[PDB]
Amino acid sequence: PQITLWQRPLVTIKIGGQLKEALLDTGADDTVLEEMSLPGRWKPKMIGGIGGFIKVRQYDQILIEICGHKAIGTVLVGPTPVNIIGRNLLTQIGCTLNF
Amino acid sequence: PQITLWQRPLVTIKIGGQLKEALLDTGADDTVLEEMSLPGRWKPKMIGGIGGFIKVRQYDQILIEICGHKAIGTVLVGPTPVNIIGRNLLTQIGCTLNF
């Protein structure tokens, strides 16, 4: 699809069989989701945002479907104001910015 | 232009005569620039993201050129780690996400 930016670009994603709303975020290197349980082991990761750095859990090779497009990659889990889809998965679904 | 998300979408903008580097950020409601002086009056505001909130000065009706396209709107100034062009100005240059 083509998504304009008059409103937040929030889309539906599916992870672990659950539907969730998430923000397509070109300013994010990575994908950060609100607290949830994911399979496997996790490793520590520090991320920096507008308000400073926080510690999150890193889960690799996680299946997630975004607006109908499948992606498998790294998902970070931690205290985030909203579920964020970052460039690591935006590139997997072929997303680009255009003007 | 069509901008890839393999790398951070950093572009050159011009504001107050000054040329600067800024991140096209569909995850940001507003545009936030690193500390600088702007003309006109401003009012304080708090904005949040990963890491929490930061206090910024809000200036209205500021003109910026983004990759040659003029855009007018509110510009917040504060301790952001990088200049961010948010949706309030991305809409003005006809910026969309496509996949």
Binding site: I47, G48 | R8, T80
Partner: peptide
């Protein structure tokens, strides 16, 4: 660092 903006 991993930047999430």
């Amino acid at each position: 660092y991993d930047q999430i903006l």
